[PDB]
Ligand binder design. Structure first.
Ligand code: 76X
Length: 165
């Protein structure tokens, strides 16, 4: 098995910005990796394409994936509304880490976050499942549209997404 690679093509108020790719750690967290992959291709009939990064805190993280309520209160996984914390093997070691957002134990859906700082206090409570492969520069440019309270000054969208070879 080769870990899958996913891409997001990011736009800022509709204007193309660049591409972020991610390695997904299917070898360590296959069930969590597979949910992100499938949401990124849209093969179940729903997913991330056209969704927004609704909360961006510079020096912390970029959060996205709420395609049902567009604001951090929604989303769903490919396995149902919620699924369990698969494992906490991987840690939040620094910028570029891809990890699941949640609302308590065993409440993973579709929302995720990209770290822009080390976030060690999240270790053992959010499932880490991937990392930025290319385009950390693009993540840094997104990040400049965020604010201390998370609200973005321009709309940051996933204009397109899918799986790379
Ligand atoms: N439903 C939900 C809400 C907040 C964060 N993650 C989630 N999956």
């Amino acid at each position: 098995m080769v870990n899958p690679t996913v891409f997001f093509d990011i736009a800022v108020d509709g204007e193309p910005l660049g591409r972020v790719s991610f390695e997904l750690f299917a070898d360590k967290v296959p069930k969590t990796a597979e949910n992100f992959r499938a949401l990124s291709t849209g093969e179940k009939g729903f997913g991330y394409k056209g969704s927004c990064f609704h909360r961006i805190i510079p020096g912390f993280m970029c959060q996205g994936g709420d395609f049902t309520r567009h604001n951090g209160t929604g989303g769903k996984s490919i396995y149902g509304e919620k699924f369990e914390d698969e494992n906490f093997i991987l840690k939040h070691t620094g910028p570029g880490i891809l990890s699941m957002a949640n609302a308590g134990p065993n409440t993973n859906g579709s929302q995720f976050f990209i770290c822009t700082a080390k976030t060690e206090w999240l270790d053992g409570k959010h499932v880490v499942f991937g990392k930025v492969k290319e385009g950390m520069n693009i993540v840094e440019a997104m990040e400049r549209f965020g604010s201390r309270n998370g609200k973005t000054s321009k709309k940051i969208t996933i204009a397109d997404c899918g799986q790379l070879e």
